Symmetry: C5
Subunit: 307 residues, 5 copies
Amino acid sequence: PVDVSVSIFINKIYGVNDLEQTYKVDGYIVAQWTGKPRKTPGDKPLIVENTQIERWINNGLWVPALEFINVVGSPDTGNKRLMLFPDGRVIYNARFLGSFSNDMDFRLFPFDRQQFVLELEPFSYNNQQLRFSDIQVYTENIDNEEIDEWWIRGKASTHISDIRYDHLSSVQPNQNEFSRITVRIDAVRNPSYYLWSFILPLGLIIAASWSVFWLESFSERLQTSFTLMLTVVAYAFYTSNILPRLPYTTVIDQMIIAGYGSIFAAILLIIFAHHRQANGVEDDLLIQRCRLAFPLGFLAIGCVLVI
Amino acid sequence: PVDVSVSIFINKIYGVNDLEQTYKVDGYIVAQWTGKPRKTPGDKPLIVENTQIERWINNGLWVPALEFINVVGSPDTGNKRLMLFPDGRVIYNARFLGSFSNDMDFRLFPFDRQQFVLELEPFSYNNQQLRFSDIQVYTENIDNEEIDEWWIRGKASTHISDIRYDHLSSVQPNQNEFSRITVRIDAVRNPSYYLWSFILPLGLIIAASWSVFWLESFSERLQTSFTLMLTVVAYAFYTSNILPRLPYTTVIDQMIIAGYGSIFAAILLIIFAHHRQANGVEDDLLIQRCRLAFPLGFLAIGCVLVI
Amino acid sequence: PVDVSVSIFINKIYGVNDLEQTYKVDGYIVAQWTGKPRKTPGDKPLIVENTQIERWINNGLWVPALEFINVVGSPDTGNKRLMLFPDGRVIYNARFLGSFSNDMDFRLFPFDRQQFVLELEPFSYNNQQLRFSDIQVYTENIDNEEIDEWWIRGKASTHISDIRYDHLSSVQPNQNEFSRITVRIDAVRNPSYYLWSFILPLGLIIAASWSVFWLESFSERLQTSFTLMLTVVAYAFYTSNILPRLPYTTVIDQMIIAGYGSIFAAILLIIFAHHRQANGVEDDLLIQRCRLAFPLGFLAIGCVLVI
Amino acid sequence: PVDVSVSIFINKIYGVNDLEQTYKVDGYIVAQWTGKPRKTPGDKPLIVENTQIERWINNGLWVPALEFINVVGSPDTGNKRLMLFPDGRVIYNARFLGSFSNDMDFRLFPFDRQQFVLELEPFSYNNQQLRFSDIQVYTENIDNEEIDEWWIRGKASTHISDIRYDHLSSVQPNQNEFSRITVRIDAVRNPSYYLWSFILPLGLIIAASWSVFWLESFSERLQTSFTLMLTVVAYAFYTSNILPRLPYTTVIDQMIIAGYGSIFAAILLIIFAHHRQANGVEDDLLIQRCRLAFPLGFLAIGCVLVI
Amino acid sequence: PVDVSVSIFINKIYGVNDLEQTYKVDGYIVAQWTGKPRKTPGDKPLIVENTQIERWINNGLWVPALEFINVVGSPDTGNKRLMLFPDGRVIYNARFLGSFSNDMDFRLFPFDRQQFVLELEPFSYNNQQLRFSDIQVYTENIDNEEIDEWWIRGKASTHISDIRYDHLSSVQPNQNEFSRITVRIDAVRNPSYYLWSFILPLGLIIAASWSVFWLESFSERLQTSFTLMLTVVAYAFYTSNILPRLPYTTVIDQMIIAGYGSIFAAILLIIFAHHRQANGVEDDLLIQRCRLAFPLGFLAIGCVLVI
């Protein structure tokens, strides 16, 4: 079994696609192993670049293909090079930009946190072993973080493991285990923007809707709710267009649904206070009570949301 | 007739395009057959990868082209390999990402269910037979389902069949039958998100639209309807922007049309009650009767929609 | 002049682009002609696939290049094969997906009808003749039509013709005429969705805008129109976002312009009735007359639109 | 210096990108020159297509590379051919679809006019001269123009010129002038659609915004302006979504600003008339005077816009 | 160490992607060095174009690969040429279109300024030195600037430097320093468009929101505020749709937040003025005081934003 030392340099992780749970990874991949020694020009290690690489493979050079398991589509490899050492060492280095897949839970959207993972595996050989994996995720940790959309927490975690493929041929008596390198990078989304421009005005609108009970007439109370109703419909739009599309509801969405209910419940209480008492009494002890209680009932439901 | 065994590993099904009735399929495809035996290095099976494969084809190796019938454009093939066994067996294994077509009816959008199908066929040979197809659609069934957008119902259904092409040449006496593999995976859309954030407020708005009869004056009844009319127009927008575009009306759209109809009929009844009775009588027994009947008439019409 | 027989299988025509007047065509293309006889393996017709095809061309095989004249960008050819017959016949067969251009008039948008055309022509040879064209547009005609967006009317029409190129070199004495195959498929757009979800509510709003005259006060009449005015501005949006972008006005767009005019003319009549009569008379014989006449005047102008 | 005759056939100019000032050009490019005579099959001119072309270049055939100077990215070349004459003439013919760049001023958007230009230049040779350029822009001039988005004014203008590159090597004593072909096609945008569906209703709303002065009360005057204000805010949206994005303001945009100014100035005048006269006189000679003057003040400012 | 002279011609910088912090660069790249002399046809420098280039590399020609460090994905290279001088000089010249990454701060969006940088480095050699870098950023400086979206300030800054790579193999004793060319182009965004069509009406709306205090009744004051609230929500949409998406708040967005705050504070003050005084007094000295103070309090807060 050949010992392969790999190294993955991660320049930038960007372009998170929430609809498809993908993310782009630009960087380099390096792999080193030692083979049969070789006659080189003079005796320094030889450099073979791009199109010249396959010429050496046509003459018999063994270069194994390592596949990104969780990739989404063939990645774009930039320049690639072979470094042929006289003592037998061989170093493959290639620039790449690829889109990778992983299960991503966005339910607590403004305050959510995700991990971007890479999974590397030889495509055809199980009799070949990844000896050690070193990643260099040397993007900043204390340079730009509050300004950046994502907060990288710690240095990336590595784990070389063995995957057992059961469904295989009938000619391998026992060789159905492959070497898989798994890189994981944890990050927390910066909620600063979504708080100020989305969660804050959504709070401002929800609160001001309770000011309908400070209207004196009943006609003023019920008609105003429908203009407030329209405003909630409009603010759900301003969010949904900018906010990413999802198959599920976020925290902000729960806030929006709470809006529709607070206004509809206000419409109920406003109409309830009118026709609850006999002979047309307006139950003014309700309008003034819920004038402050209706603000309080919403705050109590919000904490059981975090139950 | 050559016996060809295929195996299709499905990693992820995503990216449903409702406008064009298409869907993306990422995974692997493996094909094995036995030909004339071959001298290999030593005698272990030889592995030939990517660019090296066509070198063997140029020297005479027969590798048939298998085409996805219902594909939409040439698929993106990642790494590909040939496993040449000394006894004559040949194993082709390749990663692919492709977009596939099938007839998809989205009319009952929030609660719809579809089946994603693959159709595989040799491009040039009918004297060559697909012997058995094993698919490994080992995406989850009981891990994330309520969280995931689609619910896979059962393991994929397979069907090897024979397609008769009539319009052909004049030189084939009887050989116009080709082997087609047809895989089918049934899935149900998770309506959770579309219910809470779209159907519920649409119900809240449609329901609250009936509270126009609880206003006392006629001027209040007719003018408020125009503000409610605007809200339904706005809510049709909020839906149409996020919801996928379709050549037909969905359930939600019928609800929207029911919204427009519920409001317009109220305007008729509101104007009807004013000028229906002689000498300016306001038919107060109608406003109060339809005060509860108008909510019920909508609920009664909704059940005949499910007729 | 070499005799070449072509056949075009059309699997699916989709993806109509109204801004650029283009549409996608997926299917197969087959071409057969007879050349000098040939020594084949044994004596069965030889099948040459994809990358192996150009190998035969390098050794002298004559395979003319056929170009889609009205294509928009080089088409995506999937698998391609050569079937080499011993008697001299040669069969080229290839799967293709291409984008094609044609003049498309969308002015009567919901109810418009178009025809998708293909134009095939040899790229370099006039001393070589297309003998007959048979198309197999065996997409359904009576399976899904009310559910499908477009209605195919009849079997596709074919026409091989001759195009005269004047601007050419100075060395051709008379050879400036090339063989062009022209296929045409006529189709009518299904307006069901645009009627129910777009044309129907647009009528409801236009009609209900006339109910402003059933308001008793003049202040009620003029102020409500501005809320109705805003509604028409909003509904032009809901259409324009979903509806395709065009360089000209459609039927629906003409409907919207009538909306702005119906509301603006009402504002004029509402203000006219106020200040037309001496000493502040409100010309009540106008408000009630146009109470039904304003609905009728719109219906009368609509028929002269179809003049 | 070799004499090269070019000819450019333009099938369709489409896909104007206003954000990046680019446009797509589908058509053909032909080039002819005479070299050393040549032995051809029999003695007819030989035709070499696509993949076969580079075979002749590897054997020594001189085929210079002509670059589109103002191209945006490598263009999509379809089929390509070489016509080799026995007397030495060589004819290269190729289909292409490319995106081209030019400086475009969109400030007068609905009524603007542009010119589409191509610039062709040899990539490596200055000792080789483009002898004459003939373009065949045989797209219609009197077929579809009012229906088409753009109006081609005249036949394309041509200009072969010499471009002096100063910053070059130190080994060329004087050879730093290259032959550039410059083709120009003038076109005027058809404003029909943008007039009816955008400029017309924008006038209707701006005009109808002035109808606030025919309201009797002061409370009616001030509150309605805010609904008109929202309507202008809404109509600015309807335009901006459909209208192209630009780094500068168009004519329609100037109309919108005049709208906000017409409404904001109205809001100022409405509050001014209330509190301008001592002891609460309502300055009724202002409301009626600007009832007609405010439409005129807007019309007076509009002509100085075309100053 | 080989001395390599590069020259970078920049035709156009466009297509800034604010989501991914990228920008497109179209232009040419030239590189010259001197090697062992060479026998050329006759003795003039030989020109080798495109596909013919690798032919010389297969025969042994040393052409180093130079990689764009801050590129995002492999760039699109148009035509490429080699100029082989007899004395040993070699000139590589190629057209390219590439997307480049750099840290870009958009927080002061309308009035922001950025610098577009390029970083060039050999892909495999440290024993080869970039001798001097000359850029020809000869895009206009005084032709169209007020019309153009970006303002280039000065001639581009260059800097060849040495980057020390630590994490390397174990066989290099001290050779871990590479030559990096760094080009920087500073530019200021033209705020003309964003000022007129976005910041101005936002001021007009924010200012006109203070006119709610000129209403006489309390019911007029509170109900109108909810109509103004909707306008700010709508105007937050009109901005967000056209304006580029960002992970943080811009100046305009801060202005939007101030809008929501100015309106909500008015709603508090409007409700505060009603119920602040004993026995239902309406505190008329506040509505009139904040009638002008609320405009001033907003202006006072705005200057501390630029603190």
